[PDB]
Design a protein around this ligand. Structure first.
Ligand SMILES: Nc1ncnc2c1ncn2[C@@H]1O[C@H](COP(=O)(O)OP(=O)(O)O)[C@@H](O)[C@H]1O
Ligand SMILES: Nc1ncnc2c1ncn2[C@@H]1O[C@H](COP(=O)(O)OP(=O)(O)O)[C@@H](O)[C@H]1O
Ligand SMILES: Nc1ncnc2c1ncn2[C@@H]1O[C@H](COP(=O)(O)OP(=O)(O)O)[C@@H](O)[C@H]1O
Ligand SMILES: [Mg+2]
Ligand SMILES: [Mg+2]
Ligand SMILES: [Mg+2]
Lengths: 496, 496, 496
C-alpha cells in the first residue's frame, strides 16, 4: 500500500508540526550534520530545512512554499489541516469508499467552506486602530516573549501607518521597506524609522569623515607583470597609482564622498580613499546593494567611467554611532524610497531569529488585513463555525458524499483540538464546549491560550485575517487531494 | 521522550559544573585529543571548551555566553539553577502538569524573584572601603590561593580607585585598562600600576638603546629578480637598501626611535634599525597592537609614507629589565590612556591561568558593584531569602501554578545545598538550619566555606553584587524555559 | 571514580620514582622508539623524558619543572612525598572525610612543617670548610661511582671558593661559570680552572697558528649566476674573491686572528683564512656562542662591516692540545668574565652523563648552602624530626583535621622508609629505631646508606641544605592538593 505509505509520511509531518500551532507552540530544534542549531516555532522554517527522503512528504515543501508565497501566514495551519484531512480520508478508504469519491466530496466541501468563511467574516475599516492592533497581536503571537507583545504591536501599527505609501488604496507596505537593524543584546525598542539602510560594517579608516550632512552618496560594485630594468617595477606601480588617481579624480569631479561597494578592498585602496575622505563598505550582498541603490538614489554603475554628477545620489546624514557592542555606520537620510532589510535585535541569536520571523509575519498579516479588509475570529472559532455550517450542508446533501463532507468537517475541527492541546486544556471537553457555544448562535467564542480558557475572541483581541484562513483551507485541500491522487512509487529515469 | 533526553543532557552538564560552585570548588581537568591540559574551576571555561555533541546541551553554551557578556560572573550559578529548575520541572511533568503551565508558573515566579531580590538587597556607597574589599574578596573567591587573598583584593581596590576615570559617575574600569604582566614563578606582587603596555619580547639587537627617556614612540604594522649582468644583482640590492634608507630617513625626520611592529623582521632589517638605535618588536597581535597604539598615542600607520611628526607618540620611559627569567621590555610612561592586557603572574602555568581568571572576575565584580551600587548577601543567603518569600507568594496564590512556584523555590534553594555540599557540611542539616534562621527574621545568615560553618555573611565579608544574582536567576530561567519548550530531535537540512 | 583513577596514576609515578631515592638509588633505563638508551638515577630525567598519556600524571611534569626551577634538587623527594601524601589521602577519603577537609589539614600541616624545618635547621658559615665539603658530598651523592666522591667534592669546593665573585655577599656561582670539558675516557681529574671556554672542535687547517699569545680574538656569526662570455664566470670568481679580500682586509685592519663562527665554512674559505693564519670554528650553538662572546670580550657582530679595533676581544692564550683521543682547541685566557659550559669527562657515555648531572647538582647544592646559609640533617633525619613535631601539633589540635595532620606526618615519614628500603635494611625496624632515637631528644640520627646502618648524620657527613627540603615539602604539598582537587576527566575542544 504505497498510498498508505505516503499518507503515513504526511501524517508523521503533520504530527511533528502539530505541536507548534498557537501562542504556546512548543518550539522545535533544527540540528544538522554541521552541528549548527536554530530554535524556531514558525512552521515555515520547520518545513523549510528539515530532512525528508520521502517524496510524497517532499510535496509538502511545495505546498508550504505556495502558502508562504500567496498568503505569507498559515503554513502550520495548512499542514495540520492536511494531516487531519488525510486522517479521515484514510479511514474513509478503510470503510470502503473509493478515493475519487473522497476527492469529489472534499472539493465540494471546500467550495462551500470558502463560501461560508466569506459569509461569517466580520469586516474591518483601515482606521479602527484597536482592530488593527488586535490583528497585529494575533498574528504576532507565537514566537515573541510575552513581555514585549504590546511594544512590538504598537511599533508595527506605527510603522504601517507612518510608511503608508498610498498607491491607489493598496498601500505598498513591503517587508523590505521598514527600518530595523540586527544586533545582539539591548532590546526591541530599536525598531524605529531610521530613514536609510544601515549596514553592519565598521568604517575602513578611522579618519574617514564619520559625519557628512547632505553627502553626495555613490553606489559602486567593481572591485576597488614582466620586469626587465630595476625601476620597471616602480614604473608599473607608478602608472597603477596614476590611473587610480585619474579614476578617483573624475569620481571626485562628480563629487562622490560616500560609497558602499559590493566587493572587497585593499589597505592601500582604503588609505587613498580616506586620504580624500571617502566612505567605502565592502562585501555588500546583491540584495542589500540593490536596496542601497534604491534608497540612496545612486544607480549602480558597473562601468564607472561614465559616472556623472547626475548619476550621484544624496543622503541627509551619515553617522557612525557606537550603539551596543558592534560598530556600525548608522546611515540615515535616504530620501527617495522607503527601503530596508529584515534585520532585528533581541537578546540572543535564537531570540534574534525568532523576533525577525515574528515581526515579518506581523507586517504580513497587517498588510493582508489592510488590503483585503476582512477579518475572521481566530482561536479555532472560524474552524468550528465552518465545521458547523458544513454539517448543516451535510444534512442538506445525501449519499456517500455526505460521509466525505463529514470527514472534512471533522478534519477542519481538528485545528481547535490541537490549539487546545498545546494550551494544556483537555481537547475533547473544550471541543464539546466550543460546539455547544456555537450551537447557541454566537460565532466568536474560541480558545485563547494566554488565559488558558474558552472566551469571546473579539473581546480578547484574538483575530486573524480572513484571507490567511482561506488560503490555509485551500492549500490543505490541494495537499490532501494531490497526496491522495498518487497510487505507487516507481523509479524514474534520472535526467543525464 | 526527546524532552526527557534533553533534560537528561542538561542535568549531566548541571551536575558536572555543580561541584565547582564556591570557595572550595573542586577544580575540573580539561583534556583534548592534542593532549594539552589546563586546570580551571571558573564555570565559564568549563562551559567554553568542553565537547558537547548534544544540541540541547549546545544551547547552554549560548546561555553561558550571554551570562558572561552582560554580567561576566555567575555562569556556574546560572547553570546549577537551570539544573535544579529542570529537576523540579521533570518531577512536575511526571505528576501530570502540562509543560506550558510550568513555563507560566516559572515566569511569574521569576518576575517576583527579581522583585524580591530588588527589595532585599542592601545598598552600598562607593566610599565604604571595607564593603568594596568584601565584594572583591567574595568575587575573587573560588580560584585564587588562600594565602594571597588579602593581597590581591587590596591591589584590586587600589587599582580600581587609582585608575578611577570619572566618566560622569560610571567609572570606565575596563578589563584591558589595569597593568599586569605574565611571567612564570615569582609571585602576584607584580600586579602594580606600570603606566604602559609591557610586551613579553626581547630586544632584537643588544646595542639597541634600552633606556630612552621622553622617547618619540611610533607604531607600525607593515612588514619591515632578473639578473643579466655581473652587477645587476648588486644594483638590485643597492636599490633595495637605498629605498630602505629613504623610508627610514623620512621616519627619522619625524624622529621616531621606538617601534612595535605587527609583523616579522630580518637580520639585516633589525641591524640597520639598531644602527640608528631603533626599537622594533615583532609578531604583535591585532588586539595588543591596537592597545599599544591607544596607549602610546602613535596612530597605526599602514601606509608609512605619510608619517609626520604630528603622527608620532611619546612615552616617558622605555626600559629593558631582567625581572625573573624571561627578558622583556618593561615599557612604562604611556601617558594618553590607561590601556593594558590581561596577563598575570603565578608559580606554574595552571596557577597563572587560574589567577588571570580570578583577577578578571574580581575587577568585573567591583566594577558592577560601583556601577549598580547594590550588594546582596552571598553564600546562599539571597537564595534562601528569595525562596522563603516565594513560598509566601505561593501561600498567597492558588491553583496548579502554586506547584510550579514551589518548584521554583526548591530549585532556587538547591544552590545553598550545593554550596554546603562542596564545603563538606551535610546538605540537609545545614539547609534546614538556614531555613530556620531565615524564619527568625534575620536575612544575612548564609554558609561560609572558609570557616566551614553557618554564620552572618555581612560580618564574614561574603557579599556578591545584586546584579550578578539577578542575571543568574534570569539566565537560569531562560535556559530552563527554552529547554522545556523543545519537543523532538529532527534532522535539519545542512546549508549548501 | 576518576579521582581514584588520578590517584592511581600518581601512585604509579611515585612508586616508579621511589626506587631511585638515596645513594644506592637503583637506576632507571629510558628506552624509546628510536632505540637510544640512557641510564639515569636522578629524578629530574626520569620525570622529564618518560611517556605519560595520563593527564593527572602529566601535571607532575610541571611539578618537577617548578621544583627544578626554584631549587634544582629534591625532585625525587617531592614526587615520593606527593605519593605518600596521596596514599594517606586515599585512606582518609576511604574512611569518609571530605576531600576539602583533607586539603585544609594538609595546608595547616605544611605551614607548621615549614616552620618546624626553620627551627630545627642548623646554621652554617661559608668559611667552615668541612661543613661545605659534607654538604657537597651529600648532594653530589646518588650518581657517581664510590671511588671519586672525595675528589669531585674537593674540586667542587675549590671551584666555588676560587671563582667566588663577591657580588655583595651573594656569590654568583652559576652553573655556566666553572670550567670543565667533556671527553671519553681519562678521568674526572680534568675538572680544573681553565680560564676560557674550550670548544670540542679540531682546527680547520693544519698550518693555522695553534699558539697565539695575547691573540686578538673576534666573534662572528655570519656564514663564512648568468653566463654570457667565456671569461664571465672567471670574472664572477675574481670579483667574489675580491670582496672576500676586502672584508677580510678590513677585519685584519682591526687585527682579528682568532674567530669562532656560528655557521659552517667552505674549503676555499678556510684555506684563505689560514693563508693569513686565522682560527675559525664552525657550528657553534647559540648558547655556547653567547658564552664565548661573554668570555672573550668580542661582541657578536652580525653585520661585520662595522667591526672596529674597539670591538675586538683579547685572550691570553689559545692552544691545540692532543689530550686524550679527540683533538680540541684548549682555549685558555679569557680574562673578562668566568663563563663555561656543563661538559664533563668520564669513562663511557652513560657514566659521562651521570657525572655531568652529578656535578651540576653538587654546584647547585653548595650555591644554595652559601646563599641561604641554613643546612638540615639529611638521611631522613629532618623528615622524622618534622614528623614528630607535627604529631605534637596533632596532640595540640582537636577535630577531624587531626587525622589529616597525622596523615601528613605519616606521608612525610615515608621518605626515611624508602631511603632505608633502597639501602637494604628492613624498613619498619629502622623506622621504629629512628622514632625511638628522636624521642630521646637528639635530632641528627638518620640513615647512612654507605655504611648501611643508622648513625649520627652530622658526624657521618650527610647533610642536605634546608631550602631544598623546604621546596621539596612545598612542591609535594601543591602536587597532592591540586591532584586531589580534581573530580573528573572531560573531553576538551582542541584549539584550531
Ligand atoms: N492570541 C491567540 N490565542 C489563541 N489562538 C491564537 C492566538 N493567535 C493566533 N492563534 C491561532 O494560531 C493560528 C496561527 O498560528 P501560527 O503558528 O501563528 O501560524 P503560522 O505558523 O503559519 O505563522 C491562528 O489560526 C489562530 O487560530
Ligand atoms: N567567601 C565565600 N564563602 C561562601 N560562599 C561564597 C563565598 N564567596 C562566594 N560564595 C558563593 O559562590 C557563588 C559564586 O561562585 P563562583 O564559582 O565564584 O561564580 P562563577 O563561577 O560564576 O564565578 C556566590 O553566589 C556565593 O554564593
Ligand atoms: N650520604 C647519604 N646517606 C643517606 N642518605 C642520603 C645521603 N645523601 C643524600 N641522602 C638522601 O637522599 C635524598 C636526596 O636524594 P636525591 O636522589 O639526590 O634527590 P634528587 O634525585 O632530587 O637529586 C636526601 O633528601 C637525603 O635524605
Ligand atoms: Mg501564523
Ligand atoms: Mg562567580
Ligand atoms: Mg637530590
Amino acid at each position: 500500500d504505497a498510498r498508505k505509505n505516503n499518507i503515513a509520511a504526511a501524517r508523521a509531518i503533520a504530527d511533528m508540526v502539530k505541536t507548534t500551532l498557537g501562542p504556546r507552540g512548543m518550539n522545535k530544534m533544527l540540528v544538522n550534520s554541521l552541528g549548527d542549531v536554530t530554535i524556531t516555532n514558525d512552521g515555515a522554517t520547520i518545513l523549510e530545512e528539515m530532512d525528508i527522503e520521502h517524496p510524497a512528504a517532499k510535496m509538502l515543501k511545495e505546498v508550504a512554499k505556495a502558502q508562504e508565497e500567496e498568503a505569507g501566514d498559515g503554513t502550520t495551519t495548512a499542514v495540520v489541516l492536511a494531516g487531519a484531512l488525510l486522517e479521515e480520508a484514510e479511514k474513509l478508504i478503510e470503510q470502503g469508499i473509493h478515493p475519487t469519491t473522497i476527492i469529489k466530496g472534499y472539493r465540494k466541501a471546500v467550495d462551500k467552506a470558502l463560501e461560508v468563511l466569506e459569509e461569517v467574516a466580520i469586516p474591518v475599516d483601515p482606521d479602527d486602530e484597536e482592530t488593527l492592533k488586535a490583528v497585529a497581536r494575533t498574528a504576532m503571537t507565537g514566537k515573541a516573549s510575552e513581555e514585549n507583545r504590546e511594544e512590538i504591536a504598537d511599533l508595527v501599527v506605527e510603522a504601517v501607518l507612518s510608511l503608508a505609501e498610498d498607491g491607489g488604496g493598496k498601500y505598498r507596505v513591503d517587508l523590505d521597506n521598514i527600518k530595523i537593524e540586527k544586533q545582539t543584546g539591548g532590546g526591541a525598542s530599536d525598531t524605529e524609522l531610521i530613514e536609510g539602510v544601515v549596514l553592519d560594517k565598521e568604517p575602513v579608516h578611522e579618519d574617514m569623515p564619520k559625519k557628512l550632512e547632505n553627502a553626495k552618496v555613490a553606489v559602486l560594485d567593481a572591485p576597488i607583470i614582466s620586469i626587465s630594468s630595476p625601476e620597471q617595477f616602480q614604473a608599473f606601480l607608478d602608472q597603477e597609482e596614476k590611473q587610480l588617481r585619474e579614476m578617483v579624480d573624475k569620481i571626485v569631479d562628480t563629487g562622490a564622498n560616500v560609497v558602499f561597494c559590493e566587493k572587497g578592498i585593499d589597505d592601500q585602496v582604503e588609505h587613498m580613499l580616506a586620504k580624500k575622505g571617502i566612505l567605502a563598505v565592502r562585501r555588500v550582498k546583491k540584495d542589500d546593494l540593490e536596496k542601497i541603490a534604491k534608497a540612496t538614489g545612486a544607480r549602480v554603475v558597473s562601468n564607472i567611467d561614465e559616472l556623472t554628477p547626475e548619476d550621484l545620489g544624496h543622503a541627509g546624514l551619515v553617522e557612525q554611532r557606537k550603539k551596543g557592542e558592534d560598530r556600525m555606520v548608522f546611515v540615515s537620510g535616504c530620501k527617495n524610497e522607503p527601503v530596508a532589510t529584515i534585520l532585528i535585535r533581541a537578546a540572543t541569536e535564537h531570540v534574534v531569529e525568532e523576533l525577525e520571523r515574528a515581526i515579518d509575519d506581523a507586517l504580513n498579516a497587517v498588510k493582508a488585513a489592510i488590503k483585503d479588509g476582512k477579518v475572521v475570529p481566530g482561536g479555532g472559532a472560524a474552524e468550528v463555525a465552518v465545521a458547523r455550517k458544513l454539517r448543516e450542508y451535510a444534512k442538506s446533501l445525501s449519499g456517500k458524499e455526505q460521509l466525505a463532507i463529514e470527514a472534512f468537517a471533522d478534519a477542519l475541527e481538528e485545528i481547535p483540538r490541537t490549539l487546545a492541546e498545546n494550551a494544556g486544556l483537555d481537547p475533547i471537553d473544550t471541543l464539546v464546549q466550543l460546539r455547544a457555544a456555537h450551537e447557541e448562535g454566537d460565532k466568536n467564542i474560541g480558545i485563547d491560550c494566554l488565559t488558558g480558557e474558552v472566551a469571546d475572541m473579539l473581546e480578547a483581541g484574538v483575530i486573524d485575517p480572513a484571507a490567511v484562513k482561506k488560503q490555509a483551507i485551500k492549500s490543505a485541500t490541494e495537499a490532501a487531494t494531490m497526496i491522495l491522487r498518487i497510487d505507487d512509487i516507481i523509479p524514474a529515469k534520472a535526467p543525464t
